Point group: C2
Chain length 225, copies 2
Amino acid sequence: SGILVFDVNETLLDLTSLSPLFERVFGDAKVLREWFPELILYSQTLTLTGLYRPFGEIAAAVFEMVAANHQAKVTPDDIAELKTRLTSMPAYPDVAPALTRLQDAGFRLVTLTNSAPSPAPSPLEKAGIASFFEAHLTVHSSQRFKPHPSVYDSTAETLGAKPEELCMIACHIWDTIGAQARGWRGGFVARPHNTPLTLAEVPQPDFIGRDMGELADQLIASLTA
Amino acid sequence: SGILVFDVNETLLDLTSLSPLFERVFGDAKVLREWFPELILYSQTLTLTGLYRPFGEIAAAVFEMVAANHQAKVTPDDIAELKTRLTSMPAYPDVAPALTRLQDAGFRLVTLTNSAPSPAPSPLEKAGIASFFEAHLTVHSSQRFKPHPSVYDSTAETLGAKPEELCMIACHIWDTIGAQARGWRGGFVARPHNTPLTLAEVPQPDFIGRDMGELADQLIASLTA
């Protein structure tokens, strides 16, 4: 049927579980939506410039920067809470039902994350969904973040797969863009506060769902002519 | 003396002049600080995936995306206003004085922006500060956005300059990191809602100033051994 490569943070695991930390430190949970694109921004900046630190370290550094930008006090305990929450985000309820159906339709399932390899128990293990996946891959071996071509190419190589066999699934259009640039298909799931970017010459996702069940419907349906 | 290469948007020209558009369309001026890093994020994504569209086109697309994420109505007129405002940000009042001093101290002054080449009058001309600069350079000749190495390298080649002769001045640490990765010096100027990122093995700016006059003071002082 093919191999479906899933983004983890926000796509499978619920990022809004971080909201209480932002509420407390900033007086405003919506600061999550300023911090997160800054984290992705700086991960891509490190990659473009030939630098690498683990994603978690960038997350902490960016949280401190955004705090300073808001003149908000931040403590070592705040940074510890950020690490705690980022590594313990729960699975959305729509995930396990969808992954079950995808398996039964013949798809192989793997994950690919910017997050560095985790001590056991990993966030996916803690969320109870790790066992759906045959492999758990990270950008850590590449020392480059998404959407750098190395990340997708090394993932295809590791799986012994050609791009025509692969489909990247994410709620982040930057990730599907990255994979489609390497000849993979892209499947977009529309988690809250995520919309595709519509821009000339930017490829649109091959599949789209408002939730994981609807995306899985489209993937499975596509098998039958 | 040295060649000082200035970032334009937010560094020289006041990005908070866009606040009234965000207040009207979103009911929240703070959405500026969600939209701007998203714009930079997507400019880097396109660069990483081998695509180029003019910065202004990306800015319009990202404005439409952020509007959809907030369920905020956007019209053709709003996009026209974004264009008006983005291409006409006024200079901070600290800029002309500081540029005057730097010229007096014998520095050559150049601009380098992600924005595409502009019909006359340019944003810098409207702001009344274009004539301080011996060249006004853009990422157009590189077809890649900051901080990709091609942008800095093309700039050095265009100026007939060695990296050691160059200092990038910005209120965006991603821009100073980009330039310092190519052997330039970096000067950071604090602007509201911009502070440095501290991360192990990521280069820190060579100079830091709380505003442009203070940075200029330091750059000029450094000449006295």
